Design a binder for this molecule. Structure first.
Ligand code: POV
Ligand code: POV
Ligand code: A1AFT
Ligand code: A1AFT
Ligand code: A1AFT
Ligand code: A1AFT
Ligand code: CLR
Ligand code: CLR
Lengths: 421, 426, 421, 426
């Protein structure tokens, strides 16, 4: 028979559950209902709740179209014992607990493909990339102090001053054939910076021609300096908090400033991988684990937790759905372990080929790339660079005061150098 | 012969105004000297009658009214107009937890036999076409989005804005420090003519011709000229970036914005309760998720919804283009943006057994081909009071440059004091 | 039986026909077959061709999902006797010629709803707005001569020159208590326009304070004048060639400059409406009619034809798919007669209700608004405003030369007014 | 034990180098002092055989090669590598107008038994998965678009650009006219000191202190100051609009682009012949319409396609992100844009009856969990030679400000002539 059950877990946008309509009593249109069991009657096991839910998402719709692809009906129900699955005491739990104990024959959800979960339960072709990701409230903002020199590169600035030296040293050549070099530097330079200052102009007719062909250069200099200026004085270079998993901070949390509060959700594949690859990290991070992703988000916003490690796809989804773009994954979406969301199957079953072809037909005809944007998209998904419509504080405009202070001190250095020599 | 007609109030189509004197309103003429035809409307004093539940004989006029009069002369029938009490277009609901489904608004009365002809901007829809048969659309349109635009959040209410107030101080304090070092590096290698160089290099007023004399102070004066240029050029460039904000943030482009997918505290949007847009929202697959949001923000009618959009009470509104476009043309503060989604026009619904579907459809098609309602479009909604200011840099009005006038004025009134001080100084 | 045939006309993006694969010999996937009638063998009728055509598009996809909605199969064939349909000599032609002679029982294509076509063949609910539209090679470019005064309105300019008189008339008050008003106007005004000119500064200490509080006003004036400047000098206001159908040009083509070359495709609904509503226009435009829309586009680009009138939707499609945005409909997409594309049905048939309710769920669920962008979208349909990255010719910067010439003449007027008075 | 492996040349995955001396290439080390492991490649010289119609021994190295060596030590098998002669990934075609369909490229040999293991960036696909079974993806990726960016068509190759050359003349002619009227309106109510006011008001050089004396000429001098400000401010604002060309960074955004829907003379784009993208083009409903276009522009391999993109021969290219991103990181002239559509990773195909599918899949998953190929990613493709700060304003290099330097230099050389002329003048 083609009728086979489907089991899932209420979590992530892939599995979002909705209740029944008060007036209709049924799920909405194009909705396959769901099933769940409840435990009551004190110590004994009571009858199941048999509340029929409406649980859908980016995986459930794929289940719909593969159901029409292979022409099979099904029903949906949820795991009650366990969430993801751990081979605790040699017994699988959650998703794998259901699959190895049969009575499911299928499993659709955010189940991570890995060797441990595959040795007993083979997986189909993954339909979306995922893995491990670290997301933090990585947001400081550091305007580079030399943002007022950025409009030109150092090569151009230095060539500007060597020209100002070799033009003022000829305008006291085209003018000797009381206007010395000390006043041609002070003229030729007061034209570059608008024409604010009081200068002492030449008097020969061929030297005013040179001051003019230099004032045109000043006009182009200030036209091409100030072209981008209020976008260089507002451009903040955010510094990422943690370079990666293998950084010196995570290796030795203790020998630094008070260690980063980083954790995960225990009894999951993310903790499963980290305990194997980094047991020393696992020993410390066991104390910072939290029940769910919502708890992690609240902890990060409140500041008690300052880093979170979890599945890549879910964290990527939660990044774009935040009040502001404060929370962002480390590495601009960097994944330290590439896996995929597969469909759990019983070993040596002929449905695997059908499922693989049904999944790949979506890649081929490209009818789910629009489904990618239908749900997994947020406001923060398109950051508006670092420039905005913001005032200029003293934080922004403080490479000009450093230069003014540096000359405020070099003038005194050369003052004493005069008064002794 | 005798026909009963229900109509809803819609500003670009149905102008409703309570009658005065004996119960007949004026005969005011259009701009081109043409009379504004009126019809009697025994309509409720206020929407959802309640305590003032009185059928005032108001007068109605507009696009649909002129279409009614044209069909009245063509078809040779008598008619009366009375507004719907609930003030809704119509949706399908149930009461008393019963299997049967009951209609609202127009179909809550037309289906009951209380109305024979429906003349209102009623959008054609599946649930609407199941119970009554619509004629050909007399005006094809699609849903659109009206934004607030009351504050584009880049409003120069002050010309001191480009810099923040702990940088104005530190620019106006770094003038005196550099002056009192130009003076000292020159004295020990005048004070008024150092303090004048220091300023008249910043403002570019070219006032005060004293230049630092000694080689120590020419370095500091040179670098202060550089500092003055960078300060003033940053003020200028940042003021421009405030004014060249003619492209305001990210405008919603149709029903595509991710912010529409997910409800948020800042972003609020809704439509009229029991309207076509509600059916579209519940009728879209992805739109069931945020259906929770506007259910608490939905307005009873579009008039107060648009009033909320004008004020800081609603950000984005969704409604038929033929209404939102007209409202955006009458008021400069409100404009519409985004592609027209749900390109479903209006229409005239008919009863299943009404022997007028074919002939009324032919009548409206005839009105299309002869250009009668093209003339109605030019007469009723073609004012275009606003301008296509989008993709066009704005012009800085007065009250948009009033601060500089107050600056120079206050400089005068301070000068008349400073002159007393100066004459007293000597 | 539910099997009813479908007929169509190869026209517009709605009906685009492709042949069979040379290696496969059949239509592509998801392509309903199409047939077209052929005639040969000199005067007599030859044997049937039975060519395997693949006619698809927007209307064809609408037909596909309405056929799945109502669960009926069909076949597609093309009209050869007539294209759209004319009741010539009392006999219908083309689409209506087929429908009144049955052998199709259905009609999907670029068919316009109107009373004459509806009196004999009822139409379903239109799925897209359309009508009559005039498209021309709308082009010119008129930079307004006073584009250098547009940064401020007239209020602000006049109040600037009233404040300048007020300030210069007090800086020779705060300065009395050789610097006359003639030099305070020439100072206070040389600061507004940068500080280029040679001025004669005051000398009192409280008058330099006024010149300074005015130089700050000059700094803000030039910061807010030049903010948008290179977008006002480049902003071209295109003038539409024809206001509308009822303009004085179309009413009397002859009593003007040589009349506009405007025509259409004869034997169609567009000419059908125009001959009824404007027969005087029809008499003149009969000589400028052309065979097909491609001929119209080529004629407009070559310039022999300078206006084209046709169906709204097709012209809107062709506007966005041109080399450049030279061709565009008059009125920015204005339609002078609102109609829709309907489906032609035999009168008194129960399929009309089914077809209406099978078209309307496309509106309701919004699964064809994406179909709207799938085909009917062009590059020029989005445009890039009137500002670009373009040099400034004289045409742009010729409101500055008009002002310079006007002062070049007012100076001589006041020169002779001195030399006489 | 004995296994035959075919591989294709892909720069970020497969580096191919013809061996010299006896037939082994160098043992060059990486940046971190690690040896670059090599394998023997009996592939055809210069892609197609041509004149060197022989499988010349070569050495291959890269990401896939290191994955091969890891699986070689784990699985304990012998292998040899030889490049595919046709140099294609593989598509399904027919010959001699026969019903049977034949494969080319990798599956033109693996399906024939000539290859046991496939190690190449072969995208997983339906037509590809029907004939062979793919393992788990060892690198998930999607198709992306690489643009030319060689010329953004807003390149200031001169500073005289902001004005057109019949406005430079008419600004440099309107100086002498206004000078010779300042002089005449002053004379009849000097010429050198009128011609100096006239210029030094334009350039803002503040040179020449003569001011028009007579009331007739002060009006003309005032308006010439206004004209000079508007001229120079238009030059400045238009230079800025040329330099603030950050907007042209907005280019083709994924497959969803109207210019991709329809072919055009200017816009040309293509991919590699008989590749995954060709199948996706024919596997897409809307993409069959313009499939005519790239059929005449498609390239034999991605290397020469990218070379064409670098030059002015191809505008937009479509290929796997893992390749185009690396190429854009190595060369600053090429960058990629658009969302990653068709997010289908690579994989290792297997034969239907080959008894290694499960164990090879477990091996690659184990390599994922232990972070071996994360180290491979850092070693092989992580150079990041190009700046990733897109939408960051650029810095005007030399050769991007060389014209003003030549301007002042030319002023010097013309001045040494003008000084001879002036001394001779007296
Ligand atoms: C000896 C020679 C003497 C020469 C004297 C020359 C003096 C000429 C200079 C004139 C400019 C001074 C105008 C004063 C107006 C105050 C505005 C204010 O308080 O409101 C703003 C706050 O203001 C701030 O942000 C704080 C600024 C501190 C004073 C600035 C001193 C340094 C100026 C450095 C100048 C460097 C220029 C660089 C070029 C750019 C905010 O506005 P609001 O919130 O809407 O409140 C309305 C304000 N209202 C209450 C007034 C209605
Ligand atoms: C008595 C007192 C005397 C005072 C004298 C002061 C004089 C100071 C003024 C100096 C500026 C003049 C520099 C000349 C350079 C020529 C450039 C050229 O030919 O190439 C360009 C064409 O050029 C044009 O478009 C035509 C311009 C005509 C000459 C301009 C005269 C008016 C300048 C109005 C000035 C108003 C300033 C307003 C502020 C903006 C194009 O470049 P290209 O295609 O890459 O070709 C390379 C060029 N190359 C062949 C040289 C390599
Ligand atoms: C006189 C003089 C010189 S010589 C010089 N040489 C290098 N640079 C820039 C630089 O080193 N870098 C830019 C970077 C941080 F990327 C590296 C300069 O800015 C100057 C100035 C200068 C600059 C602004 C001024 F306002 C003044 Br006064 C002088
Ligand atoms: C009192 C008072 C008012 S009412 C007012 N209305 C508008 N603007 C805007 C403006 O002038 N702009 C110049 C621009 C283009 F930059 C924008 C104002 O600045 C003010 C001031 C004001 C503000 C700061 C002040 F310091 C002073 Br004194 C007055
Ligand atoms: C002195 C003086 C005055 S008084 C005056 N009054 C109105 N306008 C503008 C105007 O009338 N309109 C803008 C419009 C076309 F929309 C209508 C001015 O430009 C001026 C100038 C002026 C302007 C620029 C100058 F460069 C100089 Br000198 C003077
Ligand atoms: C000979 C010669 C060359 S090589 C060259 N390379 C770059 N640029 C750009 C530039 O200088 N810019 C200043 C900016 C920021 F606006 C862009 C040039 O202008 C030139 C000239 C040139 C051009 C016009 C001339 F008039 C002269 Br003389 C020289
Ligand atoms: C103008 C001459 C005489 C002296 C003043 C030098 C001025 C122009 C410039 C030269 C390079 C500049 C520096 C460039 C980079 C940095 C590094 C940053 O961490 C602090 C600011 C600082 C240190 C800038 C201060 C201003 C600075 C020192
Ligand atoms: C500033 C004092 C000295 C007056 C001299 C400048 C006067 C005459 C200038 C200022 C604004 C100028 C006008 C700006 C606008 C227009 C309208 C346009 O269609 C033709 C040019 C024309 C008509 C210009 C003519 C000259 C003008 C009126």
């Amino acid at each position: 028979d083609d009728h086979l059950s489907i089991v899932t877990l209420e979590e992530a946008p892939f599995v979002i559950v909705e209740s029944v309509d008060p007036l209709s009593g049924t799920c909405m249109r194009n909705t396959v209902p769901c099933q769940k069991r409840i435990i009551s009657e004190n110590k004994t096991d009571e009858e199941p709740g048999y509340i029929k839910k409406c649980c859908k998402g980016f995986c459930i719709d794929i289940l719909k179209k593969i159901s029409k692809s292979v022409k099979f009906t099904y029903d949906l129900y949820l795991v009650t014992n366990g969430k993801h699955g751990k081979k605790i005491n040699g017994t699988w739990n959650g998703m794998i607990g259901e699959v190895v104990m049969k009575r499911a024959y299928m499993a659709v959800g955010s189940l991570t493909i890995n060797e441990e979960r595959s040795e007993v339960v083979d997986f189909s072709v993954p339909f979306i990339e995922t893995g491990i990701s670290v997301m933090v409230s990585r947001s400081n903002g550091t305007v580079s102090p030399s943002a007022f020199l950025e409009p030109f590169s150092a090569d151009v600035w230095v060539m500007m001053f060597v020209m100002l030296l070799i033009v003022s040293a000829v305008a006291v050549f085209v003018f000797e054939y009381s206007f010395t070099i000390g006043k041609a530097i002070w003229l030729l330079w007061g034209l570059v910076f608008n024409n604010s200052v009081p200068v002492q102009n030449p008097k020969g007719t061929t030297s005013k021609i040179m001051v003019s062909v230099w004032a045109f250069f000043a006009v182009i200099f200030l036209a091409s300096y100030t072209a981008n200026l209020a976008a260089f004085m507002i451009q903040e270079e955010y510094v990422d908090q943690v370079s990666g998993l293998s950084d010196k901070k995570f290796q030795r949390p203790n020998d630094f400033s008070p260690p980063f509060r980083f954790g995960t959700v225990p009894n999951g594949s993310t903790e499963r991988n980290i305990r194997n690859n980094y047991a020393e990290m696992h020993a410390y991070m066991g104390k910072f684990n939290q029940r769910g992703v919502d708890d992690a988000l609240l902890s990060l916003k409140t500041g008690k937790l300052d880093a979170f490690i979890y599945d890549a796809a879910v964290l990527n989804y939660m990044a774009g759905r935040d009040e502001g773009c404060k929370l962002v994954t480390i590495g601009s979406g960097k994944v330290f372990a590439s896996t995929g969301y597969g469909i759990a199957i019983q070993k040596d079953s002929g449905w695997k080929r059908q499922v693989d072809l049904a999944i790949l037909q979506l890649f081929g005809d490209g009818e789910m790339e629009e489904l990618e944007a239908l749900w997994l998209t947020g406001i923060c998904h398109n950051e508006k660079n670092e420039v905005m419509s913001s005032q200029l504080d003293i934080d922004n405009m403080a490479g000009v005061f450093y230069m003014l202070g540096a000359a405020m001190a070099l003038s005194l250095i050369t003052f004493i150098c005069e008064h002794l020599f | 012969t005798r026909l009963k007609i229900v109509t809803i109030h819609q500003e670009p189509f149905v102008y409703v105004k309570p009658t005065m004197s004996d119960g007949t309103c004026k005969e005011e003429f259009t701009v081109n000297g043409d009379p504004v035809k009126k019809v009697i409307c025994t309509g409720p004093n206020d929407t959802s009658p309640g305590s003032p539940r009185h059928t005032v004989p108001q007068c109605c006029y507009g696009f649909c009214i002129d279409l009614l009069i044209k069909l009245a002369r063509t078809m040779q029938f008598t008619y009366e107009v009375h507004l719907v009490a609930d003030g809704k277009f119509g949706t399908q609901e149930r009461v008393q937890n019963s299997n049967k489904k009951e209609w609202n608004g127009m179909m809550g009365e037309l289906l009951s036999g209380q109305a024979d002809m429906i003349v209102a901007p009623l959008t054609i829809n599946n649930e609407r076409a199941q119970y009554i048969e619509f004629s050909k659309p007399f005006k094809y349109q699609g849903l659109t989005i009206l934004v607030k635009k009351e504050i584009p959040r880049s409003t120069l209410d002050s010309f001191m804005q480009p810099f923040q107030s702990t940088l104005w101080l530190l620019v106006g304090l770094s003038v005196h420090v550099v002056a009192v070092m130009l003076y000292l590096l020159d004295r020990f290698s005048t004070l008024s003519s150092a303090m004048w160089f220091s300023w008249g290099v910043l403002l570019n007023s070219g006032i005060g011709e004293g230049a630092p004399r000694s080689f120590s102070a020419r370095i500091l004066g040179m670098v202060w000229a550089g500092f003055a240029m960078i300060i003033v050029a940053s003020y200028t460039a940042n003021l421009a970036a405030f004014l060249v904000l003619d492209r305001p943030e990210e405008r919603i482009t149709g029903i595509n914005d991710p912010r529409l997918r997910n409800p948020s505290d800042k972003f609020i949007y809704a439509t009229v309760k029991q309207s076509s847009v509600d059916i579209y929202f519940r009728r879209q697959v992805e739109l069931s998720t945020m259906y929770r949001h506007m259910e608490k923000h939905n307005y009873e009618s579009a008039a107060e919804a648009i009033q909320a959009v004008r004020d800081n009470k609603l950000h984005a509104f969704i409604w038929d283009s033929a209404v939102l476009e007209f409202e955006a043309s009458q008021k400069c503060d409100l404009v519409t943006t985004g592609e027209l989604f749900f390109r479903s026009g209006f229409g005239i619904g008919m009863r299943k057994d009404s022997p007028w579907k074919q002939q009324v459809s032919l009548s409206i098609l005839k009105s299309h081909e002869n250009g009668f309602m093209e003339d109605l479009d030019k007469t009723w909604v073609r004012y275009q009071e606003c301008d296509s200011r989008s993709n066009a840099p704005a012009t800085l009005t007065f009250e948009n440059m009033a601060g500089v006038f107050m600056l120079v004025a206050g400089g005068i009134v301070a000068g008349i004091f400073l002159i007393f001080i100066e004459i007293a100084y000597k």
